[PDB]
Protein backbone atom coordinates (compact mmCIF):
# COMPACT_ATOMS: atom_id res chain seq x y z
CA UNK A 1 0.00 0.00 0.00
CA UNK A 2 0.82 3.72 0.06
CA UNK A 3 1.76 5.45 3.33
CA UNK A 4 -1.57 5.98 5.34
CA UNK A 5 -4.00 4.22 2.72
CA UNK A 6 -7.74 3.90 3.44
CA UNK B 1 -16.80 -3.05 13.41
CA UNK B 2 -14.10 -1.30 15.45
CA UNK B 3 -14.39 -4.40 17.65
CA UNK B 4 -13.04 -6.60 14.85
CA UNK B 5 -9.82 -4.56 14.68
CA UNK B 6 -8.98 -4.55 18.39
CA UNK B 7 -8.21 -6.99 21.18
CA UNK B 8 -10.70 -6.83 24.10
CA UNK B 9 -9.22 -4.54 26.76
CA UNK B 10 -8.27 -6.95 29.63
CA UNK B 11 -7.68 -4.19 32.20
CA UNK B 12 -9.92 -2.47 34.74
CA UNK B 13 -10.37 1.31 34.46
CA UNK B 14 -8.77 3.77 36.90
CA UNK B 15 -9.10 3.76 40.67
CA UNK B 16 -6.75 5.18 43.32
CA UNK B 17 -5.85 1.67 44.48
CA UNK B 18 -4.99 0.11 41.10
CA UNK B 19 -2.95 3.21 40.24
CA UNK B 20 -0.68 3.00 43.30
CA UNK B 21 1.55 0.40 41.63
CA UNK B 22 2.24 2.76 38.70
CA UNK B 23 2.60 6.27 40.15
CA UNK B 24 2.28 8.25 43.40
CA UNK B 25 -0.25 10.97 44.26
CA UNK B 26 1.89 13.51 42.38
CA UNK B 27 1.66 11.44 39.16
CA UNK B 28 5.35 10.45 39.45
CA UNK B 29 6.09 6.87 38.32
CA UNK B 30 7.14 4.39 41.01
CA UNK B 31 10.81 3.23 40.99
CA UNK B 32 9.49 -0.29 40.27
CA UNK B 33 7.40 0.61 37.20
CA UNK B 34 10.20 2.93 35.96
CA UNK B 35 12.67 0.05 36.12
CA UNK B 36 10.30 -2.37 34.36
CA UNK B 37 9.94 0.18 31.56
CA UNK B 38 13.72 0.55 31.42
CA UNK B 39 14.31 -3.22 31.30
CA UNK B 40 11.90 -3.60 28.37
CA UNK B 41 13.53 -0.67 26.55
CA UNK B 42 16.97 -2.31 26.86
CA UNK B 43 15.63 -5.66 25.61
CA UNK B 44 13.79 -4.20 22.60
CA UNK B 45 16.73 -1.97 21.62
CA UNK B 46 18.79 -5.18 21.26
CA UNK B 47 16.25 -6.64 18.82
CA UNK B 48 15.90 -3.30 17.00
CA UNK B 49 19.67 -2.95 16.47
CA UNK B 50 19.77 -6.48 15.00
CA UNK B 51 16.64 -6.06 12.85
CA UNK B 52 17.88 -2.78 11.36
CA UNK B 53 20.84 -4.62 9.81
CA UNK B 54 18.30 -5.88 7.24
CA UNK B 55 16.58 -2.53 6.62
CA UNK B 56 16.60 -0.88 3.17
CA UNK B 57 19.89 1.13 2.82
CA UNK B 58 18.16 3.77 0.67
CA UNK B 59 15.35 4.89 3.01
CA UNK B 60 16.63 7.65 5.30
CA UNK B 61 13.20 9.11 6.23
CA UNK B 62 11.78 9.78 9.70
CA UNK B 63 8.67 7.73 8.99
CA UNK B 64 10.21 4.40 7.89
CA UNK B 65 13.99 4.97 7.68
CA UNK B 66 17.28 6.04 9.26
CA UNK B 67 16.42 9.57 10.40
CA UNK B 68 13.61 8.07 12.49
CA UNK B 69 16.05 5.79 14.33
CA UNK B 70 18.19 8.86 15.04
CA UNK B 71 15.09 10.64 16.43
CA UNK B 72 14.71 7.73 18.88
CA UNK B 73 18.35 7.81 20.02
CA UNK B 74 18.41 11.60 20.48
CA UNK B 75 15.37 11.06 22.70
CA UNK B 76 16.96 8.17 24.63
CA UNK B 77 20.05 10.33 25.13
CA UNK B 78 17.83 13.08 26.59
CA UNK B 79 15.98 10.58 28.82
CA UNK B 80 18.88 8.43 30.07
CA UNK B 81 21.98 10.59 29.52
CA UNK B 82 23.98 7.58 28.26
CA UNK B 83 26.64 8.88 25.77
CA UNK B 84 26.37 5.67 23.72
CA UNK B 85 22.86 6.74 22.68
CA UNK B 86 24.20 9.98 21.20
CA UNK B 87 26.87 7.95 19.37
CA UNK B 88 24.21 5.59 17.98
CA UNK B 89 22.26 8.65 16.82
CA UNK B 90 25.38 9.88 14.97
CA UNK B 91 25.67 6.66 12.95
CA UNK B 92 22.01 6.80 11.87
CA UNK B 93 22.28 10.51 10.97
CA UNK B 94 25.27 9.72 8.75
CA UNK B 95 23.32 6.97 6.97
CA UNK B 96 20.32 9.29 6.54
CA UNK B 97 22.39 12.09 4.98
CA UNK B 98 23.43 9.64 2.24
CA UNK B 99 19.76 9.11 1.31
CA UNK B 100 18.59 12.59 0.30
CA UNK B 101 16.39 12.27 -2.79
CA UNK B 102 15.32 15.91 -3.29
CA UNK B 103 11.69 14.85 -3.85
CA UNK B 104 10.02 15.88 -0.57
CA UNK B 105 10.18 18.62 2.05
CA UNK B 106 8.78 16.95 5.20
CA UNK B 107 10.32 15.79 8.50
CA UNK B 108 8.54 12.43 8.11
CA UNK B 109 8.97 11.58 4.41
CA UNK B 110 11.42 14.10 2.90
CA UNK B 111 14.92 15.56 3.14
CA UNK B 112 13.90 17.80 6.09
CA UNK B 113 14.03 14.84 8.49
CA UNK B 114 17.71 13.95 7.81
CA UNK B 115 18.71 17.64 7.78
CA UNK B 116 16.85 18.78 10.91
CA UNK B 117 17.86 15.71 12.93
CA UNK B 118 21.47 16.12 11.74
CA UNK B 119 21.46 19.80 12.80
CA UNK B 120 20.40 18.85 16.35
CA UNK B 121 22.79 15.89 16.59
CA UNK B 122 25.80 17.92 15.43
CA UNK B 123 24.78 20.66 17.88
CA UNK B 124 24.65 18.18 20.79
CA UNK B 125 28.13 17.02 19.77
CA UNK B 126 29.55 20.59 19.74
CA UNK B 127 30.06 20.49 15.95
CA UNK B 128 29.07 24.02 14.95
CA UNK B 129 30.18 23.87 11.29
CA UNK B 130 28.17 20.75 10.42
CA UNK B 131 25.17 21.93 12.46
CA UNK B 132 25.06 25.29 10.65
CA UNK B 133 25.50 23.67 7.21
CA UNK B 134 22.50 21.43 7.94
CA UNK B 135 20.37 24.44 8.97
CA UNK B 136 21.28 26.30 5.74
CA UNK B 137 20.25 23.33 3.60
CA UNK B 138 17.02 22.93 5.60
CA UNK B 139 16.07 26.59 5.09
CA UNK B 140 16.66 26.36 1.32
CA UNK B 141 14.66 23.12 1.05
CA UNK B 142 11.50 25.26 0.82
CA UNK B 143 12.21 26.17 -2.82
CA UNK B 144 12.37 22.61 -4.16
CA UNK B 145 8.61 21.96 -3.97
CA UNK B 146 6.04 24.78 -4.21
CA UNK B 147 2.52 23.50 -4.96
CA UNK B 148 3.12 20.88 -2.26
CA UNK B 149 0.02 19.74 -0.27
CA UNK B 150 -0.62 21.13 3.23
CA UNK B 151 -0.63 17.93 5.37
CA UNK B 152 1.89 16.10 7.61
CA UNK B 153 3.53 13.38 5.50
CA UNK B 154 4.13 15.29 2.24
CA UNK B 155 2.97 18.88 2.77
CA UNK B 156 3.68 22.24 4.37
CA UNK B 157 2.98 21.44 8.02
CA UNK B 158 5.44 18.54 7.68
CA UNK B 159 8.15 21.03 6.67
CA UNK B 160 7.14 23.46 9.43
CA UNK B 161 7.61 20.73 12.03
CA UNK B 162 11.26 20.32 10.93
CA UNK B 163 11.87 24.05 11.47
CA UNK B 164 10.17 24.00 14.90
CA UNK B 165 12.20 20.88 15.83
CA UNK B 166 15.45 22.76 15.25
CA UNK B 167 14.30 25.82 17.23
CA UNK B 168 13.07 23.71 20.14
CA UNK B 169 16.32 21.76 20.45
CA UNK B 170 18.72 24.70 20.01
CA UNK B 171 16.61 26.67 22.51
CA UNK B 172 16.94 29.72 20.24
CA UNK B 173 15.37 31.03 17.02
CA UNK B 174 17.80 29.49 14.51
CA UNK B 175 15.12 29.53 11.81
CA UNK B 176 13.64 33.08 11.72
CA UNK B 177 9.94 33.35 12.57
CA UNK B 178 9.44 35.13 9.23
CA UNK B 179 10.19 31.87 7.40
CA UNK B 180 7.50 30.00 9.38
CA UNK B 181 5.09 32.95 8.94
CA UNK B 182 5.39 32.85 5.14
CA UNK B 183 4.50 29.13 5.01
CA UNK B 184 1.59 29.66 7.41
CA UNK B 185 0.22 32.42 5.13
CA UNK B 186 0.38 30.05 2.12
CA UNK B 187 -1.54 27.37 4.07
CA UNK B 188 -4.31 29.79 5.07
CA UNK B 189 -4.57 31.24 1.53
CA UNK B 190 -4.71 27.74 0.05
CA UNK B 191 -7.45 26.72 2.52
CA UNK B 192 -9.64 29.77 1.83
CA UNK B 193 -9.18 29.36 -1.94
CA UNK B 194 -10.23 25.71 -2.01
CA UNK B 195 -13.27 26.31 0.22
CA UNK B 196 -14.24 29.21 -2.09
CA UNK B 197 -13.75 27.11 -5.26
CA UNK B 198 -15.98 24.30 -3.96
CA UNK B 199 -18.43 26.56 -2.07
CA UNK B 200 -17.60 25.06 1.35
CA UNK B 201 -17.23 28.58 2.76
CA UNK B 202 -20.61 28.80 4.51
CA UNK B 203 -20.01 25.61 6.55
CA UNK B 204 -16.18 25.58 6.53
CA UNK B 205 -14.15 28.72 5.61
CA UNK B 206 -11.06 26.53 5.04
CA UNK B 207 -10.68 23.27 3.11
CA UNK B 208 -7.74 21.02 2.23
CA UNK B 209 -7.20 17.81 0.23
CA UNK B 210 -4.51 15.21 -0.48
CA UNK B 211 -4.47 12.82 -3.46
CA UNK B 212 -7.90 14.17 -4.40
CA UNK B 213 -9.65 13.29 -1.12
CA UNK B 214 -10.84 15.37 1.83
CA UNK B 215 -8.85 13.59 4.56
CA UNK B 216 -10.05 14.34 8.10
CA UNK B 217 -7.29 13.05 10.39
CA UNK B 218 -3.80 13.90 11.67
CA UNK B 219 -1.54 12.27 9.07
CA UNK B 220 -3.05 13.55 5.83
CA UNK B 221 -6.06 15.63 6.83
CA UNK B 222 -7.88 18.59 8.42
CA UNK B 223 -7.27 17.68 12.10
CA UNK B 224 -3.49 17.80 11.59
CA UNK B 225 -3.58 21.12 9.71
CA UNK B 226 -5.92 22.85 12.21
CA UNK B 227 -3.92 21.52 15.17
CA UNK B 228 -0.92 23.36 13.67
CA UNK B 229 -2.81 26.55 12.74
CA UNK B 230 -4.02 26.81 16.36
CA UNK B 231 -0.44 26.55 17.73
CA UNK B 232 1.08 29.74 19.27
CA UNK B 233 4.31 28.73 17.46
CA UNK B 234 2.70 29.50 14.09
CA UNK B 235 1.45 32.93 15.26
CA UNK B 236 -1.86 32.99 13.35
CA UNK B 237 -3.67 36.24 14.24
CA UNK B 238 -6.67 36.34 16.58
CA UNK B 239 -8.64 37.60 13.56
CA UNK B 240 -7.90 34.56 11.39
CA UNK B 241 -8.08 32.18 14.38
CA UNK B 242 -11.72 33.15 14.97
CA UNK B 243 -12.92 33.93 11.43
CA UNK B 244 -11.20 31.05 9.58
CA UNK B 245 -9.82 28.30 11.85
CA UNK B 246 -12.49 27.96 14.56
CA UNK B 247 -15.50 27.48 12.18
CA UNK B 248 -13.41 25.01 10.18
CA UNK B 249 -12.55 23.08 13.38
CA UNK B 250 -16.27 23.02 14.20
CA UNK B 251 -17.01 21.53 10.77
CA UNK B 252 -14.65 18.66 11.64
CA UNK B 253 -16.26 18.20 15.07
CA UNK B 254 -19.62 17.76 13.28
CA UNK B 255 -18.22 14.81 11.25
CA UNK B 256 -17.98 12.69 14.44
CA UNK B 257 -19.58 9.22 14.28
CA UNK B 258 -22.15 8.29 17.01
CA UNK B 259 -19.36 6.23 18.62
CA UNK B 260 -17.06 9.24 19.11
CA UNK B 261 -14.64 8.15 16.36
CA UNK B 262 -14.07 10.15 13.13
CA UNK B 263 -14.18 9.09 9.42
CA UNK B 264 -10.90 8.94 7.41
CA UNK B 265 -12.38 11.19 4.69
CA UNK B 266 -15.47 13.39 4.40
CA UNK B 267 -18.43 11.21 3.42
CA UNK B 268 -16.94 7.87 4.51
CA UNK B 269 -19.59 5.80 6.32
CA UNK B 270 -17.40 3.02 7.74
CA UNK B 271 -16.48 3.46 11.43
CA UNK B 272 -13.46 1.17 11.44
CA UNK B 273 -10.04 2.74 12.05
CA UNK B 274 -8.86 3.80 15.51
CA UNK B 275 -5.42 5.11 14.50
CA UNK B 276 -3.27 8.20 14.80
CA UNK B 277 -3.34 8.47 10.98
CA UNK B 278 -7.15 8.03 10.73
CA UNK B 279 -9.73 8.46 13.53
CA UNK B 280 -9.95 9.50 17.20
CA UNK B 281 -6.24 8.97 18.21
CA UNK B 282 -5.21 11.70 15.74
CA UNK B 283 -8.28 13.96 15.88
CA UNK B 284 -7.93 14.34 19.67
CA UNK B 285 -4.95 16.73 19.25
CA UNK B 286 -7.12 19.23 17.36
CA UNK B 287 -9.79 18.95 20.07
CA UNK B 288 -7.37 19.54 22.97
CA UNK B 289 -5.67 22.48 21.23
CA UNK B 290 -9.10 23.95 20.36
CA UNK B 291 -9.98 23.70 24.06
CA UNK B 292 -6.72 25.42 25.10
CA UNK B 293 -7.23 28.27 22.60
CA UNK B 294 -11.01 28.80 22.66
CA UNK B 295 -11.97 27.43 26.12
CA UNK B 296 -15.28 26.01 24.86
CA UNK B 297 -16.46 22.99 26.86
CA UNK B 298 -17.69 21.14 23.75
CA UNK B 299 -14.08 20.56 22.65
CA UNK B 300 -13.17 19.01 26.01
CA UNK B 301 -16.26 16.79 26.05
CA UNK B 302 -15.34 15.54 22.54
CA UNK B 303 -11.78 14.79 23.74
CA UNK B 304 -13.18 12.66 26.61
CA UNK B 305 -15.20 10.74 24.00
CA UNK B 306 -12.02 10.11 21.97
CA UNK B 307 -10.24 8.74 25.05
CA UNK B 308 -13.18 6.42 25.77
CA UNK B 309 -13.29 5.09 22.19
CA UNK B 310 -9.54 4.47 22.40
CA UNK B 311 -9.75 2.77 25.81
CA UNK B 312 -12.32 0.37 24.35
CA UNK B 313 -10.97 -0.23 20.84
CA UNK B 314 -7.39 1.11 20.97
CA UNK B 315 -5.42 -2.12 21.50
CA UNK B 316 -4.97 -2.90 17.81
CA UNK B 317 -4.42 -6.27 16.11
CA UNK B 318 -2.40 -4.14 13.68
CA UNK B 319 0.44 -3.95 16.23
CA UNK B 320 2.22 -1.67 18.71
CA UNK B 321 3.43 1.13 16.41
CA UNK B 322 2.78 4.89 16.48
CA UNK B 323 1.04 5.64 13.13
CA UNK B 324 -1.56 2.90 13.65
CA UNK B 325 -0.84 0.92 16.83
CA UNK B 326 -1.20 0.67 20.61
CA UNK B 327 1.74 2.96 21.50
CA UNK B 328 0.51 5.75 19.20
CA UNK B 329 -2.97 5.31 20.67
CA UNK B 330 -1.57 5.50 24.22
CA UNK B 331 -0.23 8.99 23.45
CA UNK B 332 -3.85 10.16 23.19
CA UNK B 333 -4.18 9.47 26.93
CA UNK B 334 -1.01 11.40 27.80
CA UNK B 335 -2.15 14.50 25.87
CA UNK B 336 -5.47 14.47 27.74
CA UNK B 337 -3.64 13.84 31.03
CA UNK B 338 -1.34 16.81 30.35
CA UNK B 339 -4.36 19.08 29.73
CA UNK B 340 -6.62 18.02 32.60
CA UNK B 341 -4.18 16.72 35.25
CA UNK B 342 -6.66 13.81 35.59
CA UNK B 343 -4.66 10.76 36.76
CA UNK B 344 -7.26 8.49 35.11
CA UNK B 345 -5.60 9.21 31.76
CA UNK B 346 -2.07 8.68 33.06
CA UNK B 347 -3.37 5.33 34.34
CA UNK B 348 -4.79 4.40 30.91
CA UNK B 349 -1.40 5.20 29.33
CA UNK B 350 0.37 2.99 31.89
CA UNK B 351 -1.96 0.06 31.07
CA UNK B 352 -1.35 0.48 27.34
CA UNK B 353 2.37 0.36 28.21
CA UNK B 354 1.74 -2.81 30.22
CA UNK B 355 0.36 -4.28 26.97
CA UNK B 356 3.45 -3.17 25.01
CA UNK B 357 5.65 -4.84 27.65
CA UNK B 358 4.34 -8.16 26.30
CA UNK B 359 5.46 -7.15 22.79
CA UNK B 360 5.00 -9.97 20.28
CA UNK B 361 2.85 -12.20 22.51
CA UNK B 362 -0.58 -11.27 21.10
CA UNK B 363 -0.42 -12.57 17.51
CA UNK B 364 -0.10 -9.07 16.01
CA UNK B 365 0.83 -8.76 12.33
CA UNK B 366 4.48 -7.99 11.50
CA UNK B 367 4.80 -4.37 10.19
CA UNK B 368 6.14 -3.70 6.68
CA UNK B 369 9.08 -1.92 8.35
CA UNK B 370 9.25 -3.86 11.67
CA UNK B 371 11.90 -1.65 13.34
CA UNK B 372 10.89 1.83 12.10
CA UNK B 373 9.78 4.90 14.09
CA UNK B 374 6.24 5.09 12.66
CA UNK B 375 5.43 1.47 11.70
CA UNK B 376 7.71 -0.57 13.97
CA UNK B 377 9.64 -1.14 17.18
CA UNK B 378 11.53 2.19 17.36
CA UNK B 379 8.20 3.99 17.90
CA UNK B 380 7.11 1.56 20.62
CA UNK B 381 10.48 2.02 22.35
CA UNK B 382 10.11 5.81 21.99
CA UNK B 383 6.75 5.74 23.80
CA UNK B 384 8.00 3.54 26.66
CA UNK B 385 10.94 5.91 27.31
CA UNK B 386 8.73 9.02 27.00
CA UNK B 387 6.34 7.62 29.64
CA UNK B 388 9.14 7.77 32.24
CA UNK B 389 8.47 11.52 32.62
CA UNK B 390 4.78 11.81 31.59
CA UNK B 391 4.45 15.61 31.83
CA UNK B 392 7.14 16.04 29.17
CA UNK B 393 5.87 13.28 26.86
CA UNK B 394 5.01 14.29 23.26
CA UNK B 395 3.98 12.18 20.24
CA UNK B 396 7.21 12.37 18.16
CA UNK B 397 7.47 14.03 14.74
CA UNK B 398 4.11 15.70 15.34
CA UNK B 399 3.06 17.03 18.74
CA UNK B 400 4.24 20.49 19.79
N1 LIG C 1 2.40 -0.47 6.10
C1 LIG C 1 1.55 -0.60 7.32
C2 LIG C 1 0.24 -1.32 7.00
C3 LIG C 1 -0.80 -0.43 6.32
C4 LIG C 1 -1.64 0.38 7.28
O1 LIG C 1 -2.02 -0.08 8.36
N2 LIG C 1 -1.96 1.61 6.88
C5 LIG C 1 -2.79 2.53 7.64
C6 LIG C 1 -2.65 3.95 7.13
S1 LIG C 1 -1.03 4.73 7.36
C7 LIG C 1 -4.28 2.16 7.68
O2 LIG C 1 -5.05 2.84 8.36
N3 LIG C 1 -4.68 1.10 6.97
C8 LIG C 1 -6.06 0.89 6.63
C9 LIG C 1 -6.72 -0.23 7.44
O3 LIG C 1 -6.15 -0.60 8.49
O4 LIG C 1 -7.79 -0.69 7.00
C10 LIG C 1 2.34 -1.32 8.43
O5 LIG C 1 3.04 -2.31 8.09
O6 LIG C 1 2.21 -0.89 9.59
ZN1 LIG D 1 -1.05 4.94 9.90
Residue numbers in the entry:
A (entry chain C): 1 to 6
B (entry chain A): 0 to 399
Provide the publication's sentences verbatim.
We next set out to determine the structure of LanCL1 in complex with GSH and a (Z)-Dhb-containing 13-mer peptide (DHTGFL-Dhb-EYVATR) corresponding to the sequence of the activation loop of Erk (1.91 Å resolution). The optimization of peptide soaking duration resulted in the structure of native LanCL1 with electron density at the active site consistent with the presence of GSH in a covalent complex with Dhb-Erk. Density was only observed for the GFL-Dhb-EY segment of the substrate peptide, which is clearly connected to the GSH molecule (distance between the former GSH sulfur atom and former Dhb β-carbon is 1.91 Å). The inspection of the non-hydrogen atoms attached to the Cα and Cβ of the former Dhb residue in the peptide indicated that both carbons have tetrahedral geometry suggesting that the crystals contain the product of the thia-Michael addition of GSH to Dhb-Erk peptide. We have previously suggested that a conserved His in the active site may serve as the active site acid that protonates the enolate intermediate to set the 2S stereochemistry. Indeed, Nε2 of this His residue (His219 in LanCL1) is 3.7 Å from the α-carbon of the former Dhb, consistent with the proposed role in catalysis. The distance between the thioether sulfur atom and the zinc ion is 2.7 Å suggesting that the sulfur was indeed bound to the zinc ion as the thia-Michael addition progressed. The most unexpected observation revealed by the co-crystal structure is a hydrogen bond between the carbonyl carbon of the former Dhb and Nε2 of His277 (distance of 2.8 Å). Other than the hydrogen bond between His277 and the carbonyl oxygen, no other obvious contacts are observed between the peptide product and LanCL1, consistent with the high substrate tolerance of LanCL1 shown in a previous study. In the cocrystal structure with the Dhb-Erk product bound, the amino acids flanking the methyllanthionine (Leu and Glu) both turn away from the active site and do not make any specific interactions with the enzyme, nor do the amino acids that are two residues N- and C-terminal from the methyllanthionine (Phe and Tyr).
